[PDB]
RNA sequence: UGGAAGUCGGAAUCCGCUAAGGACUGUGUAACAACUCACCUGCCGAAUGUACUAGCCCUGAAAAUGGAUGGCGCUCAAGCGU
């Protein structure tokens, strides 16, 4: 995980990085080869978490591709 | 001067056939190497196919005999390149043998067959060839099958 | 005597008939004839 | 088998968990501070205690430095608290002493000084064997 | 004893004399004794059982039609190059419940 | 098990007020909540209703089918 | 002194229901919401804490019993290599071990996710994870356990070679006799019979001379090729005739009623001469009832001088 | 694992370290050296108290 | 209903077979009427008919039809106004209990010596007269029961004995033998399979089908033929005496 | 469904005579006398013809109807009983410690004793004493055999079994310890 | 494949005699042998089989003092449906 892009119950959420269900997080895509049109390496892309962490124990994403 | 009958399954220019005989053909009182030697000279025609193989037992001495099959049969008919045994394995019988050449391996096996007609006889050689995995005039010889029971092929008759 | 033999080695056991406690309320005939009419009607 | 000595009568038991007694043998050890019974039972509270024949566990507080880190299977032989036997003498020893042996009853050391008791050398031979007075 | 050995005894000596009979009669048995479990087994026991039942049913019935039919995509064409194959730019998951803050 | 020598503890058929009124409002609270969501159901529905039919073991079931068949032709015939 | 000491190993289903089954029923499992959360949490950590223990008390007995290839003598390591493919042994008690700190390091982490949790639910939620994590990874070695549980039978029946002692070593050809002489001089039950391998694996029995015990080693029997057409059968008695510092016993039937060769025999036993170094080697011509060495041929009479 | 032991198994060829007889005679003796040498390392290197 | 007999479900190839199989012997034996002169019907009761397919192989010339009775029965014609030829309804009456046909351009007096003379020795079924007496004798068991000499058997494999218990030889296991009593044999004596002159049972003619002796015959008796030139059937000796229906 | 009438049918021979009275069945033959009390079973007991029983239920269940089964067979089997007899011949097989049997009759109590010795090589002597009726012999013809005849064939076929199930080997492995005393045929006396 | 004969494995699974019989459902052998099943025929004698639907009944998870259809007690009910 790169940063914390989005929590969208409360700004003061997103800050402090809470990661909860519906939260857009980026994340570090250099290992699934994904590059532009010219031959840049794309190391950055937005996730989004569709569990719930605190009552799963892992924390689970999709891509927005 | 009672006779003896023992039928084995062994491959053709090969002597140690007579491995699994020595337990029984010992007490008969046969020699394990004649007999091995009667073999592979019995067998030297079928070079690297699985005949099987008679024994007359009489007095102590035992005369040997290749008894025909029809897998064996198909299989010679193929024509397969000559082979060594150990090195490589796993090979398919993937070539082609003639309908006339069929009719001759059903006439070899008429004293074998319980078919009334040389037709009846021609379709089993035809479905051992099946299982075999050969073909018969480049088809398949289920379809031969099909096509001979359909009667657009004319089988000879005797 | 008895001719064959029982799975269970019970040999004194009757030769027991079916369980068919609805019998002699159809005669055979009739039967046959209902089969047909519900054959012709379906 | 558990080192429990079989047809042994009761008899009181004058040492428990934590007494230090006398060494007998030559092992090189001159005493046995006892840390468990073999034999004893399950009680609330109640210490396990062990008498003359009994087999016990040991730690070595003095002797040999080869003996100081191990803990030993140990038979008691002598007990200073009086009992009785059978034939209703009443009799205790002037000292608490006990030897040092292997769990099948075979003894590390190759002569005890002073005597034994009657109950330990019946019940294991080797004392027996070992033995210069019995009483 | 050494390798096959219990099978070496049961070469040279056989089995007991009753042994092929007491396994018909327990082979008999068993649907009485299936029957019984399924209606006298209480609680979790129970449940893991009929769970365990269901299973079998299942495969049992599979099994079935597979021996039974062993003798026998999308609406608009498409090439094989855009099967498998799938404005408003909306994310997967657009509304969650919202969180308080003791929560 | 040993139920007829040992008896367990028996399991009370004596409902508890407290029980009954949440049984109830639970209930009642299931019946509005699953017709909200009969409304808001999206699996598809048949306006016809595929009618069970007309028994096999009914003795005049070939009489009823020549009725049926000769108001049928009555009817093509009257249209 | 064996491995028949080693516990039974129970397939991944039946590990699943054994350690769920000692979570369900050797602790309590009434929690009620009312309680407080420090007594939920202790709960519910005790329960994984108690499942991750039957876990890894079952994979250690299952390590720890297993022998271990690296300490073993070439003898016996060979003999276990012949029979089983070594690297699926180890590949099996690694995964077995790998599962064990898999499981060890998923507890930890709920455990201390269940410090922080607030809540009955959360707490049960938890729990629920860490346990079907754990159920997981053992059904994920389904075939490593049938694998060992097969390895322990058959090492549960497996003879006991002492590789440093008085030992005679019965070798050659099948059908020579080998058996017969087991057991005309030993108490070992090794069947006799006229058809060839009829020994597949390596039998041992006893006998006393001069008030000295001396174990005699009967063999799979060996055919006349390289050792890359070998079979695991007759490797058994390759690695015997390798690694046995032993008094060798090459068996030899003159009559050839073994159904081979007395000149194939010969080759053989110039073929496996070079393992003889260092050991006493003995010819022993079997079944001279039949036909004798005066009888043979001199010139095989000659290649045998 | 089903086809290298079992019921199922269909594994007949094991995997050696070595090819010729002479070399199955010298891997013997390095392992035996190996095994005696590992034996005196351990050894080298009544129950004891906690 | 609940309790009932859990009715296995075969994992096999083979089905029934129905009425398709009736209706195909239907069309073989209406088709086979027009082509031959002669159709025989012969009886073989409470027999193996294993070698049937010999007698087939070596009547090549011939059809041989062994289904159902009343099936033939019914493909010949019972009554005048169904018979496919005349006289075939003459013919059925002889078709009772196990029955067959025989369609034949031969001679009629051929096919009588071919099935006078023919005889093989076969095993015997329940319900036969055992012609003599067999006994087990005791100690170590052979595979004929006593039938060759001892020293020329080979002895009784060791999976066959709990089927000898089940049929009730009291054999046991003595070193991978099987044995009545001892091995030597002592504190035993044979063991009656049958007695000459008593009705044998399924027991005792499986206990004999497992030492192999035969103590039946292979015989096919001819009970009449009807011709198609004549329209008529010639009835034959066993046609008297057979029941008839 | 209740079924109005539904009826079964026991020949007997002429040498056994038959008394029913309050469903309490007596049974005499060449052999002995059988006696059994089927009150617990609604049947109606008749003559529906020389030499013939008739069972018969009214307005019984399927369960009533099925029991008349029971009934049917259970007088069938005392006539053949008090006919013919039943037989069991068990056989008792040793490993290593041969097996010592002993019958007597007790005298006062009128019934058979069997006394087993050194099964497993065990000190303990095992007993075990038959139903009146029931008489055991050691059979001479064969090696290690019992035979239990008699007219009740509830009353042999369960000292046969408690014969079997006194012997029973307990903590050992049953595939390598085969020993015990086992029923080997059944049958009829005549 | 050391051995593998329907029954350790992989792939195919055809024809003939048929009344019918799988290149085989299991037991079994080192491999065979032998037994058995699918299927067919002979005896018998008239109704059955499968899958669902609706009732009642059993199970469908329980802790911790001794107790609760309100209590006795109730079984062609003093239970259930009309
Ligand atoms: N006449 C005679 N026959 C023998 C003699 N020794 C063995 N035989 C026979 O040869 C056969 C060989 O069987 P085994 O004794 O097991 O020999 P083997 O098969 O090589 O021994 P294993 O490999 O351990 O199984 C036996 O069945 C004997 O009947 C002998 O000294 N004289
Ligand atoms: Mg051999």
């Known amino acids: 995980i790169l940063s914390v892009k989005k929590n969208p119950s409360n700004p003061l959420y997103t800050q402090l990085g809470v990661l909860t269900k519906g939260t857009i997080i980026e994340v570090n895509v250099s290992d699934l080869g994904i590059v532009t049109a010219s031959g840049k390496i794309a190391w950055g892309r937005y996730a989004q978490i569709t569990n719930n962490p605190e009552n799963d124990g892992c924390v689970n994403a999709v891509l927005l591709v | 001067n009672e006779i003896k009958i023992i039928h084995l399954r062994a491959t053709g220019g090969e002597v140690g056939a007579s491995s699994a005989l020595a337990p029984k053909i010992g007490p008969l009182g046969l020699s394990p190497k004649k007999v091995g030697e009667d073999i592979a000279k019995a067998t030297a025609d079928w070079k690297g196919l699985r005949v099987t193989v008679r024994l007359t037992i009489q007095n102590r001495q035992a005369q040997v005999s290749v008894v025909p099959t029809a897998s064996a049969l198909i299989i010679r008919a193929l024509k397969e390149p000559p082979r060594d045994r150990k090195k490589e394995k796993n090979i398919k019988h993937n070539k082609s043998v003639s309908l006339d050449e069929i009719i001759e391996i059903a006439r070899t096996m008429r004293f074998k067959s319980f078919s009334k007609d040389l037709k009846g006889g021609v379709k089993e050689i035809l479905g051992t060839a099946f299982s075999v995995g050969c073909q018969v005039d480049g088809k398949s010889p289920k379809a031969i099958s099909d096509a001979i029971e359909a009667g657009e092929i004319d089988i000879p008759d005797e | 005597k008895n001719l064959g033999m029982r799975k269970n080695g019970q040999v004194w056991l009757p030769a027991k008939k079916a369980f068919r406690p609805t019998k002699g309320l159809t005669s055979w005939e009739l039967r046959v004839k209902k089969r047909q009419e519900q054959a012709a009607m379906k | 088998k558990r080192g429990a000595p079989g047809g042994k009568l009761k008899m009181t038991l004058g040492l428990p968990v934590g007494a230090i007694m006398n060494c007998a043998d030559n092992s090189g050890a001159r005493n046995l501070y006892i840390i468990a019974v073999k034999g004893a039972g399950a009680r609330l509270n109640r210490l396990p205690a062990g008498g003359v024949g009994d087999m016990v566990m040991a730690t070595v507080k003095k002797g040999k430095p080869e003996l100081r880190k191990k803990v030993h299977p140990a038979v008691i032989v002598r007990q200073a608290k009086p009992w009785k036997r059978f034939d209703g003498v009443f009799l205790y020893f002037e000292d608490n002493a006990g030897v040092i042996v292997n769990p099948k009853g075979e003894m590390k050391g190759s002569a005890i000084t002073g005597p034994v008791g009657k109950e330990a050398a019946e019940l294991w031979p080797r004392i027996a064997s070992n033995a210069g007075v019995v009483m | 004893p050494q390798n096959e050995y219990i099978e070496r005894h049961r070469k040279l000596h056989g089995r007991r004399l009753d042994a092929e009979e007491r396994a018909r009669k327990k082979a008999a048995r068993e649907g009485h004794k299936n029957s019984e479990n399924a209606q006298n087994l209480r609680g979790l026991r129970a449940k893991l059982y009929a769970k365990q039942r269901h299973a079998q049913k299942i495969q049992m019935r599979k099994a079935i039609k597979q021996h039974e039919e062993r003798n026998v995509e999308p609406s608009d064409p498409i090439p094989s190059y855009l099967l498998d194959r799938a404005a408003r730019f909306s994310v997967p998951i657009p509304k969650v419940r919202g969180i308080s803050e003791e929560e | 098990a040993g139920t007829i020598n040992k008896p367990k503890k028996p399991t009370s058929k004596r409902k508890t007020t407290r029980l009954r009124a949440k049984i109830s409002k639970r209930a009642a609270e299931k019946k509005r909540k699953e017709r909200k969501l009969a409304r808001k159901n999206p699996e598809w529905r048949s306006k016809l209703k595929k009618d069970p039919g007309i028994p096999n073991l009914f003795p005049y079931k070939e009489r009823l089918l020549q009725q049926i068949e000769e108001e049928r032709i009555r009817r093509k015939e009257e249209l | 002194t064996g491995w028949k000491d080693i516990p039974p190993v129970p397939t991944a289903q039946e590990f699943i229901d054994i350690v769920l089954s000692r979570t369900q029923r050797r602790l309590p499992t009434q929690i009620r919401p009312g309680f407080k959360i420090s007594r939920i949490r202790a709960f519910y950590t005790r329960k994984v804490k108690f499942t991750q223990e039957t876990c890894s008390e079952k994979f250690g007995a299952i390590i720890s019993s297993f022998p271990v290839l690296s300490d073993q003598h070439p003898f016996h390591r060979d003999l276990m290599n012949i029979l089983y493919d070594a690297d699926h042994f180890k590949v099996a008690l690694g995964q077995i071990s790998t599962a064990k700190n898999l499981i060890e390091t998923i507890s930890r982490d709920y455990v201390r996710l269940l410090k922080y949790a607030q809540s009955l639910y959360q707490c049960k939620q938890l729990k629920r994870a860490a346990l079907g994590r754990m159920a997981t990874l053992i059904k994920r070695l389904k075939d490593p356990l049938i694998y060992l549980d097969q390895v322990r039978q058959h090492l549960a029946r497996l003879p006991d070679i002492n590789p440093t002692t008085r030992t005679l070593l019965v070798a050659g050809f099948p059908n020579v006799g080998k058996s017969s002489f087991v057991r005309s001089v030993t108490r070992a039950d090794t069947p006799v019979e006229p058809y060839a391998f009829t020994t597949k694996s390596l039998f041992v029995g006893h006998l006393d001379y001069k008030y000295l015990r001396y174990q005699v080693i009967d063999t799979p029997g060996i055919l006349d090729h390289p050792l890359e057409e070998m079979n695991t059968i007759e490797m058994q ?60 041929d001199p010139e095989m009479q000659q290649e045998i001088n | 694992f089903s086809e290298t032991f079992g019921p199922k198994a269909q594994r007949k060829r094991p995997k050696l370290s070595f090819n010729t007889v002479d070399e199955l005679a010298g891997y013997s003796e390095q392992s035996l050296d190996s095994y005696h040498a590992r034996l005196e390392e351990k050894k080298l290197l009544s129950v004891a108290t906690a | 209903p609940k309790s009932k007999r859990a009715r296995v479900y075969h994992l096999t190839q083979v089905n029934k077979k129905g009425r398709e199989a009736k209706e195909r012997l239907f069309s ?104 003599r007496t067999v006994t087990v004798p005791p100690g170590i068991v052979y595979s004929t029961g006593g039938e060759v000499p001892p020293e020329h058997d080979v002895p009784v494999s060791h999976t066959l004995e709990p089927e000898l218990r089940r049929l009730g030889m009291p054999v046991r296991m003595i070193k991978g033998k099987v044995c009545l009593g001892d091995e030597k044999g002592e504190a035993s004596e044979g063991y009656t399979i049958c007695k000459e002159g008593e009705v044998l049972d399924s027991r005792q003619t499986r206990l004999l089908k497992l030492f192999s002796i035969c103590l039946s015959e292979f015989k096919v008796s001819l009970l009449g033929y009807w011709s198609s030139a004549s329209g008529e059937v010639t009835e034959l000796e066993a046609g008297k005496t057979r029941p008839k229906r | 469904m209740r079924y109005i009438h539904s009826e079964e049918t026991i020949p007997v021979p002429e040498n056994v005579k038959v008394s029913i009275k309050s469903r309490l069945v007596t049974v005499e033959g060449p052999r002995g006398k059988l006696q059994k009390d089927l009150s617990h079973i609604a049947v109606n007991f008749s003559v529906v013809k020389k030499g013939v029983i008739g069972l018969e239920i009214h307005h019984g269940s399927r369960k009533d109807v099925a029991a008349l089964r029971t009934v049917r067979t259970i007088i069938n089997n005392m006539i053949i009983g008090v006919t013919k007899g039943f037989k069991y011949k068990m056989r008792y097989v040793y490993a290593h410690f041969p097996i010592n049997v002993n019958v007597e009759k007790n005298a ?83």
């Open chain 7, 237 to 296: 008695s390759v690695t015997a005739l390798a690694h046995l510092r032993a008094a060798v016993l090459y068996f030899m039937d003159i009559s050839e009623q073994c159904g081979f060769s007395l000149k194939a025999q010969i080759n053989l036993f110039k073929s496996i001469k070079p393992l003889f170094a260092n050991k006493m080697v003995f010819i022993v011509l079997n079944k001279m009832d039949i036909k004798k060495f005066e009888e043979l």
């Open chain 9, 28 to 131: 073989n034996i209406r088709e086979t009427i027009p082509k031959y002169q002669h159709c025989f019907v012969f009886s073989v009761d409470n027999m193996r008919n294993n070698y049937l397919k010999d007698v087939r192989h070596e009547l090549n010339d011939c059809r041989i039809f062994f289904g159902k009775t009343k099936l033939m029965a019914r493909a010949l014609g019972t009554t005048p106004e169904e018979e496919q030829a005349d006289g075939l309804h003459r013919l059925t009456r002889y078709l009772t209990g196990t029955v067959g046909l025989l369609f034949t351009n031969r001679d009629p007096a051929d096919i009588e010596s071919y099935f006078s003379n023919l005889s093989q020795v076969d095993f015997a079924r329940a319900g036969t007269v055992a012609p």
């Open chain 10, 108 to 190: 006062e109590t009128g019934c058979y004793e069997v006394e087993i010795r050194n099964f497993i090589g065990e000190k303990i002597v095992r007993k075990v004493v038959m139903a009146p009726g029931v008489e055991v012999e050691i059979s001479k013809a064969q090696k290690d055999e019992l035979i239990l005849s008699g007219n009740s064939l509830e009353a042999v076929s369960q000292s046969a079994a408690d014969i079997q199930q006194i012997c029973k080997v307990r903590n050992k492995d049953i595939r390598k310890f085969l020993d015990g005393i086992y029923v080997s045929e059944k049958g009829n006396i005549v």
